[PDB]
Design a protein around this nucleic acid. Sequence first.
DNA 1: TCAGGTAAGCAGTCCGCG
DNA 2: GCGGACTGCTTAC
Length: 903
Amino acid sequence: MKEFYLTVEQIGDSIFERYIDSNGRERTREVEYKPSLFAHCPESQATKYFDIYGKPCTRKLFANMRDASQWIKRMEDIGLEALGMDDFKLAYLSDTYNYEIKYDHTKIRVANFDIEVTSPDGFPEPSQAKHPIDAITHYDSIDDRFYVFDLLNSPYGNVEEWSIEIAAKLQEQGGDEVPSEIIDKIIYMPFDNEKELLMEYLNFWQQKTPVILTGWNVESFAIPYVYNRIKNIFGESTAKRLSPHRKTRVKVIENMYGSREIITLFGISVLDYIDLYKKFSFTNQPSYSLDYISEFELNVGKLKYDGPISKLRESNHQRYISYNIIAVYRVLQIDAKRQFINLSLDMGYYAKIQIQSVFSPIKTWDAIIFNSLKEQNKVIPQGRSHPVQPYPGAFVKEPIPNRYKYVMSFDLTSLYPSIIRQVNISPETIAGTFKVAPLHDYINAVAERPSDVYSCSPNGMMYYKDRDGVVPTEITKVFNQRKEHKGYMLAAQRNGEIIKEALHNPNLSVDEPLDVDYRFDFSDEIKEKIKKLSAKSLNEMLFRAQRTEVAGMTAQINRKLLINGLAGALGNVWFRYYDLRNATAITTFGQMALQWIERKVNEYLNEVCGTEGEAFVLYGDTDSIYVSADKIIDKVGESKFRDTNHWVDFLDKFARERMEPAIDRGFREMCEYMNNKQHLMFMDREAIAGPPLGSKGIGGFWTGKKRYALNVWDMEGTRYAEPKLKIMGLETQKSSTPKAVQKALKECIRRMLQEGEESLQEYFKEFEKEFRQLNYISIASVSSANNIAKYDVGGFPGPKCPFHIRGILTYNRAIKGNIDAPQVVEGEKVYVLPLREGNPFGDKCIAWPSGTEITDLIKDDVLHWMDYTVLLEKTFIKPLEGFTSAAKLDYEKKASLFDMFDF
DNA sequence: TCAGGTAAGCAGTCCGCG
DNA sequence: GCGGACTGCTTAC
Ligand SMILES: Nc1ccn([C@H]2C[C@H](O)[C@@H](COP(=O)(O)OP(=O)(O)OP(=O)(O)O)O2)c(=O)n1
Ligand SMILES: [Ca+2]
Ligand SMILES: [Ca+2]
Ligand SMILES: [Ca+2]
Ligand SMILES: [Ca+2]
Ligand SMILES: [Ca+2]
């Protein structure tokens, strides 16, 4: 077995490394690593080090790391470039692990924990840590055990021991329903005092020192609280035992509105699961409480308790501890699904970085590129200071707002990375510039050919064609990994649809799910067996298929994020290879590609339809085109089709056999025009959309840029058992839109697209009639809340006060002088409700923390003064009016001469 | 909201628009 | 009332 690092730190002139040795044991070592840096030289031909531009360099080997850093300073004082990896631990890892790291996750100690702290006077601030820690549950991945540390005696109450027997029981037996599958994995330790609890926890920590430390808000709450509480009680040296190297640092985290403090534990990699989720889940949520996210991800019920959490330990210590345990498990369950820890380890070891650096695409790419170049004895340039400057991005076509009955979409594969590879865009491949014409001249192929020697982008940049740049080389490797995982994801998706189809005809038998790999398309034999299965077995298979799809999605979408992040890093001032010429070369080439192919598709379809100057491409954004297919369908005639699937098959064939070849030819011509290194503009059919055959559905509509809805039957080769609504940008997709309103608007859209005007009018009438019954949370708006202080003038709205902030100030006056009332946290999200004229709150709206019930102090008054009329017009009617006007439809039946008779 | 990028939509404030 | 300038917040890509 090859060795692999666990953590790496620089402390003074020493590297501290925890690692798994060749025998599979965890070890720690201190290494007086001597770094090398580089300087340009005339020079001797006997040097083997060259910078990325091929200029010779001499290697300077330093007695220690502090000397290397001081040399970098002097080179700045002199005014000369100091070359090489200035983050010495990355250099250390590169030297020590000079091969593709093969890691064994079963040897990596992954800990997730959660603490409880009873506090009668508001939120227990981690910086103060003035209240006892009264529960800790710490799950260890190697032991596969939940270690529970329970405080029985506190200034806030003495309690009895937690009972595992009651914990296991149904809530209907008076129990806590701790999942039976973890009951035998709980190791319960009660303590008669907090000093002994904390001393034992530290001893335990020493024995089972986390490598990866996770949980929910551990970086912002649990770690700082534990550290500071131990500091308060025992002193600093004891608190630093949370670090395997006894080194910690208060770190100030800054943003534009203010700052906060965290504790850096040297020799541990903290991956707070809230931040993993925010980065990798590709959701935007109304609330990020563990309860809310658990319900969203796992469909588990809210953990129910009576009274405030500040009195939960005293009133029901049994439930208090059970819910602490369950909280830790819910994070494990989310990870079992989303696999963000796996992803982080995968990417971290690939790049050869501290695992926690996966949060930084810039740090990730710096290490990948450094390691690649080092292999060639090439020397990386010094990072430089650059002023932040705006630069142009993608093209978006202005659509004509309308209904669109039949639509086929086409999309470029991994556009920006494909552009980088096609054009050969890299720091070291810049060949020069050419004289640019207006972009429209390149789009229309009337501008002079930029170069007969070099590979070009319409921003005026030229690149070498003799060899691949390091950016193209390394981006290709990750692109290839992404493609493999996307393949598994789509197969799992297709397999899921086979199971859905079979669920129409389930067998009345007792059987088991098939043991299959959902990452590969089901064979004919598997399909035959599926048709013979019970509903229970099919549903279990569907769950597993959907879990496989989620696993593939995590692996693929985040590799996509990383590669797109390299294109973005070229436009970030902190990136070692920051260059607006390269960043703009990518974006400007993309603008041309989209508009180039729009023209080619229009020309092609006008030719096949025998028309002149008709717009077949109705819309496009960045790298996709949406093509009106009404004329194609009408050329055979709707009456000629047996069913919906029949015209779907037909459009699918037309897209693949006629349109994609035309698109390919168009892009090959563009490649030769720009004299690019390799043709990589691959534009495949994405969606096939239309109304059900024989229906009055409108199929799709656009209201404007980034705002459209389509009834989709096939997506990237997945033929759905039921048509799928693809809605982009509209209020149904916005976290700010109330939950019940998202749901109602989506149904309005479904009816528009699938059923027609009359169906839409029927639903609207009913929703308008009944909406006042809806639960207040489901009809509250949601917003992030920044600069509460800025707009606060003696508890009242200052000039230009945003609506949601006004709501917070209303709330703040209403709960004033109440220490136990939930506080709105700056930078987090709130529910917002409008209030009727003459309410006791003294203003037109109120806001409270999102994901929560509003305090019982004011709940009744809020419910009584809720402005349902304003709520409805603003969140429901106004957006619907936008949808319907765009689609040339009415949500309310217009009067006609026909109505009425029947006397 | 510490942590790659730009384009661009809508809510709301403030106030003009004879 | 609607739009323009502007802030705030949110999506699409
Ligand atoms: N978060 C994002 C998403 C998009 N884009 C840019 C880079 C993409 O290449 C391009 C098109 O976005 P897509 O969503 O269509 O994604 P890709 O084309 O990269 O991947 P694919 O279509 O293969 O899934 O827009 C970006 O810079 N950052
Ligand atoms: Ca808790
Ligand atoms: Ca794409
Ligand atoms: Ca595709
Ligand atoms: Ca069957
Ligand atoms: Ca796209």
